[PDB]
Design a protein around this motif. Structure first.
Motif, mmCIF file in Angstrom:
data_model
loop_
_atom_site.group_PDB
_atom_site.id
_atom_site.type_symbol
_atom_site.label_atom_id
_atom_site.label_comp_id
_atom_site.label_asym_id
_atom_site.label_seq_id
_atom_site.Cartn_x
_atom_site.Cartn_y
_atom_site.Cartn_z
ATOM 1 N N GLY D 128 -15.555 6.407 30.971
ATOM 2 C CA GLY D 128 -16.518 7.285 31.774
ATOM 3 C C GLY D 128 -15.445 7.779 32.948
ATOM 4 N N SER D 129 -16.109 7.757 34.333
ATOM 5 C CA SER D 129 -15.625 8.114 35.475
ATOM 6 C C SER D 129 -15.042 7.205 36.323
ATOM 7 N N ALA D 130 -13.991 7.231 36.731
ATOM 8 C CA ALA D 130 -13.147 6.119 37.609
ATOM 9 C C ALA D 130 -13.457 6.207 39.033
ATOM 10 N N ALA D 131 -14.267 7.256 39.569
ATOM 11 C CA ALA D 131 -14.287 7.434 40.951
ATOM 12 C C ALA D 131 -15.194 6.383 41.670
ATOM 13 N N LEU D 132 -16.194 5.981 41.026
ATOM 14 C CA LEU D 132 -16.933 4.716 41.870
ATOM 15 C C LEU D 132 -16.208 3.552 41.914
ATOM 16 N N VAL D 133 -15.366 3.156 41.068
ATOM 17 C CA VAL D 133 -14.656 1.877 41.021
ATOM 18 C C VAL D 133 -13.373 2.279 41.883
ATOM 19 N N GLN D 134 -12.914 3.343 41.906
ATOM 20 C CA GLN D 134 -11.517 3.635 42.589
ATOM 21 C C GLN D 134 -11.993 3.505 44.007
ATOM 22 N N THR D 135 -12.926 4.011 44.528
ATOM 23 C CA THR D 135 -13.725 4.198 45.636
ATOM 24 C C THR D 135 -13.702 2.602 46.212
#
Ligand SMILES: N[C@@H](CCC(=O)O)C(=O)O
Ligand SMILES: N[C@@H](CCC(=O)O)C(=O)O
Ligand SMILES: N[C@@H](CCC(=O)O)C(=O)O
Ligand SMILES: N[C@@H](CCC(=O)O)C(=O)O
Lengths: 255, 258, 258, 255
Positions: D128-135
């Motif tokens: 999926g999308s990494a954004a949340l975890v990266q944040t």
């Protein structure tokens, strides 16, 4: 007095342990002597109004007469078809009267439609099918019927108990007594009046400030039925058995 | 199956329009082909406890029983005998099933006495008179019965719907189905047992296969079967395509005997 | 309104797909036109008590609190932090709202301690650190927070959702809406009061207009407003066409202050 | 070892207070020395299976591999995204690790679709999308992610935790450790193997009766990722910090 009788109990009557004991004793005394089919019909007194206050549910009104919103009809059904109905049942059991609790929708006794979209879950009563009640009466049960109905599409409806009683008495071919705290109209008591005479006395301010509403309700019922309806009080209760036998102990509104 | 049948509704059924629609679609499907006398028995659901919370009234439930104080019994009677019963009735009408709402006191159908004064207004059910219901059934009505009763002295009583269902079935000479989220009992290869005796149940409890809450549920079924002196079905409302067959006597869940 | 806003969901909301659909349709309607940071706070609903009944576990609720024994806290955490929270999250996804499920312990958002050992695992909420939520909000996520917390010693805690909502709002500098079946407070001409001070509330209680369960509800709102030092809105989910306006600061129910 | 690491915790690990204390101590000891982004991913051990037994919910199976019926997914979501996730959070709090609990659907981290109508509510994981975890990582939080997802149409999905971990590590560009009770494969220990070598040893009956399943899962993950995955046990826990730094303390399955 052969032929069925609907006894409709008013709010202040249900609110009063005193009144119920008297009413139920009167039913017993009557039954020992006479054998006329009896049906009780009721709304809900302060049981409903007090519960709704507890739940912050307003008494809404769109230019006149009550509104029953989606968020009220279940709770009202509860107080009315539940608490009030089963309280009266408990009184019947206490006085060894074989009784059955019903609501308007049971056996489609009184058919109910949507009175008006803007009043929400308020039902317009109209005569239904007598079969269920006739069956119960013939089997020796006294039905105790609440003024909650169900539309044909499955929606619960709060119905004016007076109008419900009228639709019931028409369904059954029954006489009708609207029993409350108003003993009768004076001018020296008046035992019989036409509805038109009752309107006249209101019009000219003879009929008492509070309780025009009670005479209006009897006179509407009389006209809807095309035959007389009794107003009577529980107060002089030694007189209630004569009432249930046909004697106008309070005031009969003829048509 | 030609015997009368009591169908007891567990809480989750009343709490969910999907579950009610499945139940009632099944009832219509079954009555298209079969005419065996059917009686619905029900308790409260979520809505009693919702209402208790709205009125900030305390709740104590233990051993399958709700302590029902003098100042709660009327409200509870309202939610059970009133809202729940009439909701069910409305489902019946909506499905063109001629139904009649009763409670246990109507016709002295199931007699109730005070169970235990420290529980407040909680009733012990026992069989009463079949006359009223038999009259309704013979006239073609499907009774829908709430688990509120009245003592001979005129006191309102909150009664355990499972025990009331048993008293009712006994009064009616009826079979009994306890319908809830529980589909059947598992045999600890994890498989559903179609027909389970008391002896099999003990074995499963002794061995720790039926544990905790299943023990209570299984005992409620066994106590039902012992009172009635005939078997009792346990089933779920989920696979509602199977429910007509259940109502026609096929044990789609677990049948309990002995 | 540009302040962050905590919307606290009362039980009935979680118990009903109609209510959830109205709530979420309102959230979408509101976010079309407005971008104020929104946080959802929720407790349990019917589903905890359903689950307790299924497992034949006892229930004692008093004074707004459920005695939460050692052998129930994990199950309760499952129903609240798990099923309820993730159900809400699923509603968010279904409505294309980028949401994030948290509980009170996440980021030490709301700090909890043991309220009272005889209640078992019940937590007292107090304000914690705003950092985590502020980070999520600034990145465009709508947090959905359950009312389960964890003590500094690592014990799971069942916390009153109203008190947790208050601790949260205080932590966030947020406004607070308590959304339930209660639409507002009535003034005993039976009319809704748009804006009610503490003084007006006492008058109404002293006079016996606000009574019983409304007293408890009104006190929960006042205790919220006193902690936060700013007003708190009470509203119902029913007229959901009005909810966007509520979320934009219009007091559609009763605003409580002082 | 810069670059994120997903540590996936096996059932028997979650069932064991002993194991968790060791794992969490190991996380602390590692963090003091090194500063690699860490993400925990988990399924549910006996917490799930025991609860389902209590509720008479069967472990159904349509010719192979589990079925999650409509009447199970809520309860499982509860045990898994709820009890198991928040238990691990409690462990992080107890060891002063700033942690955030998530599920797959949060931030669409791991996208989930319906694997197969006949298995019910089982999800197929995919990156999926990494954004949340990266944040969260950049803000100093350790995410602890459960293997429950939500389809784009709003349906809860039970997802194989191993496959979830694989989809997560691909989303993040992370290494992957499948931590369980299997310390490693012997023949004299084997520190590195290709997946094909691991299949061979199974094929010829060298790899232990029970725990073919654990090697199969590592070797599938390795191939899905196109890069190596570690198998390791919590048992020798003084060695876990070296593992989290890149040392294959158990068995690396290469590709
Ligand atoms: N019990 C009241 C009102 C009940 C009703 O109409 O719903 C009466 O008939 O006087
Ligand atoms: N509150 C009732 C519930 C009736 C029922 O669902 O069995 C009792 O415990 O007696
Ligand atoms: N069972 C929880 C409910 C949480 C809530 O709804 O406030 C308690 O009393 O603490
Ligand atoms: N916790 C178990 C199974 C959990 C799952 O895959 O849902 C494992 O990964 O070994």
């Amino acid at each position: 007095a052969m032929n069925p009788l609907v006894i409709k109990l008013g709010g202040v009557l249900l609110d009063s342990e005193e009144a119920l004991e008297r009413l139920f004793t009167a039913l017993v005394t009557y039954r020992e002597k006479h054998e006329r089919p009896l049906v009780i019909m009721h709304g809900g007194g302060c049981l409903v109004d007090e519960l709704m206050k507890r739940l912050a549910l307003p008494v809404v009104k769109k230019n006149g007469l009550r509104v029953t919103p989606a968020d009220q009809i279940d709770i009202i059904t509860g107080a009315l078809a539940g608490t009030a109905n089963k309280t009266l049942l408990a009184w019947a059991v206490k006085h060894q009267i074989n009784a059955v609790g019903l609501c308007l929708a049971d056996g489609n006794t009184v058919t109910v439609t949507l009175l008006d979209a803007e009043l929400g879950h308020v039902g317009k009563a109209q005569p239904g099918s007598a079969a269920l009640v006739q069956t119960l009466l013939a089997a020796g049960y006294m039905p105790i019927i609440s003024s909650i109905g169900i539309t044909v599409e499955g929606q619960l409806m709060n119905v004016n108990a007076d109008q419900a009683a009228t639709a019931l008495a028409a369904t059954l071919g029954a006489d009708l007594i609207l029993l409350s705290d108003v003993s009768g109209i004076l001018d020296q008591r008046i035992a019989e009046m036409t509805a038109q005479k009752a309107e006249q006395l209101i019009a000219q301010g003879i009929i008492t400030d509070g309780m025009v509403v009670k005479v209006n309700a009897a006179l509407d019922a009389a006209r809807s039925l095309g035959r007389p309806v009794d107003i009577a009080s529980w107060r002089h209760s030694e007189q209630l058995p004569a009432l249930f036998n046909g004697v106008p102990i309070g005031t009969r509104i003829s048509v």
